[PDB]
Write a protein that binds this ligand. Structure first.
Ligand SMILES: CCCCCCCCCCCCCC(=O)SCCNC(=O)CCNC(=O)[C@H](O)C(C)(C)COP(=O)(O)OP(=O)(O)OC[C@H]1O[C@@H](n2cnc3c(N)ncnc32)[C@H](O)[C@@H]1OP(=O)(O)O
Ligand SMILES: O=C(Cc1ccc(F)cc1)Nc1ccc2[nH]cc(C3CCNCC3)c2c1
Ligand SMILES: [Mg+2]
Length: 411
């Protein structure tokens, strides 16, 4: 069924996943010295290339590969168009490993054919709360706690093979060579997501969308006018009124985050993320990197009460190419990132996110039902989208968990 995934250290079925009771590794313990020094063999007409993702011209070459060949919606109406600034941000967080960014190029002209990127993340990925309870009931607490400590692993994203090279088994070669380069740094697990089903997810969640510019969304067929609106004399007018938002934020003392906020945001975030079974641990440098505002890329606001940061939210921008509309070239989408509320209900905090995104010319706000994102779906008028984002580990057995126990946002 899966000539490649069947050879890999991942759970092979839902049945298998159903059995898993403790977190821990799948594969034989191995050492750096065991791993081949040399890149995985590849056809003599291709060559491996490590782009410098802080060099503009290399970022640009990756940017074009992804712009023309990366993930589309199911009807080939949209394709993600991550910006060059977004790729430098995503691919180069503090202590990133340049060798984990892996490309294939055609040796002749150096056309870029394929890419995959890994970045470091520190993740809590020990046995989940519901399984630790069962473990206590069986007198198996110590085995259940063995891998509780946050682990330094690889987060993989941006796997892409050129549309002309599809279904040539090139993706598995990219994945093998990435795994080699990560293992050569003594890292043995990875976390990744995909909108496709692969062997075998530890969590799965729906996507959600909140319309900000419904006339544009309907025009590009991101959204329809829903059938119930036909009872109205002017369905579109009622649709716009439905999604209208305040022109300015409602929380007094909302402002953009600044460098001086980094310690208080780290504290409130890290306290909040603790309540989830799987989640990242961020240093001050990482909070700085992932949350300080960056034009066109990431937008972060804090609620400041008595010179104190009590709440914050962030979102990032990924535009999508709209394929074949005469009025519009791009869908301007905001994605809910990390947040923490301590002084106000989460719906009141996120309503400000929608207000800001709307004021800044975003067409839609998107998220997956991780974190406590379900708590504000109804009141903030999010609707479920198509399909599901699935979360995976490489070389890590892990009991199935609800997406509301996941706190790792994936770009
Ligand atoms: C410790 C360190 C470990 C580090 C690595 C951890 C693992 C990281 C794993 C990567 C996490 C990626 C996270 C993301 O970025 S998910 C986003 C993936 N990218 C896209 O969807 C962009 C457009 N599509 C493409 O570029 C290609 O279709 C891709 C590259 C996806 C497949 O290229 P192609 O269509 O030309 O096929 P092939 O003949 O070369 O290969 C066929 C094999 O590939 C398996 N396949 C298909 N889609 C995926 C997929 N999304 N993840 C993993 N495997 C996938 C498939 O089941 C089959 O294996 P098997 O079924 O025969 O066994
Ligand atoms: O934005 C969308 C819908 C869409 C799909 C394909 C397009 F070409 C353009 C738009 N879905 C969506 C909504 C919320 C999300 N939160 C995280 C992701 C994924 C983005 C791609 N990398 C993996 C995470 C994500 C995806
Ligand atoms: Mg291929």
């Amino acid at each position: 069924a899966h000539a490649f995934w069947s050879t890999q250290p991942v759970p092979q079925t839902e049945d298998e996943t159903e059995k898993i009771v403790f977190a821990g590794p799948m594969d034989e313990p191995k050492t750096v010295a065991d791993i081949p020094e040399e890149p995985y063999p590849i056809a003599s007409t291709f060559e491996w290339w490590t782009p410098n993702m802080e060099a503009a011209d290399d970022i640009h070459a990756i940017y074009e590969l992804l712009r023309d060949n990366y993930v589309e919606d199911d009807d080939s109406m949209f394709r993600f168009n991550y910006s060059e600034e977004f790729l430098q941000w995503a691919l180069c967080p503090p202590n990133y490993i340049p060798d984990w960014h892996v490309a294939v190029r055609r040796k002749a002209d150096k056309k870029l054919l394929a890419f995959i990127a890994g970045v470091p993340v520190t993740l809590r990925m020990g046995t989940p709360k519901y399984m630790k309870v069962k473990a206590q009931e069986k007198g198996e607490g110590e085995e259940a706690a063995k891998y509780d400590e946050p682990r330094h692993i690889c987060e993989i994203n941006f796997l892409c093979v050129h549309k002309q090279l599809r279904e040539k088994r090139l993706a598995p070669i990219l994945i093998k060579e990435a795994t080699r380069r990560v293992n050569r740094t003594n890292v043995w697990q990875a976390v990744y997501t995909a909108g496709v089903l692969l062997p075998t997810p530890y969590a799965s969640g729906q996507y959600f969308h909140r319309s900000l510019n419904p006339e544009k969304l309907v025009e590009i067929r991101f959204s329809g006018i829903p059938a119930q609106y036909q009872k109205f004399q002017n369905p579109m007018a009622m649709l716009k009124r439905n999604y209208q938002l305040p022109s300015a934020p409602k929380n007094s003392g909302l402002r953009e985050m600044k460098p001086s906020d980094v310690p208080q945001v780290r504290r409130i975030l890290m306290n909040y993320l603790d309540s989830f079974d799987v989640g990242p641990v961020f240093s001050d440098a990482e909070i700085s990197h992932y949350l300080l505002p960056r034009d066109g890329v990431v937008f972060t606001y804090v609620v400041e009460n008595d010179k104190k940061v009590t709440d914050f939210f962030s979102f990032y921008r990924i535009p999508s190419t709209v394929i074949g509309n005469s009025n519009y070239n791009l869908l301007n989408a905001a994605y809910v990132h990390y947040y923490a509320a301590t002084s106000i209900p989460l719906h009141q905090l996120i309503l400000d996110l929608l207000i800001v995104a709307h004021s800044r010319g975003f067409d839609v706000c998107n998220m997956v039902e991780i974190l406590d994102n379900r708590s504000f779906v109804e009141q903030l008028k999010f609707g479920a989208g198509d399909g599901h984002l699935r979360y995976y580990f490489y070389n890590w057995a892990y009991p199935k968990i609800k997406p509301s126990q996941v706190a790792l946002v994936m770009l």
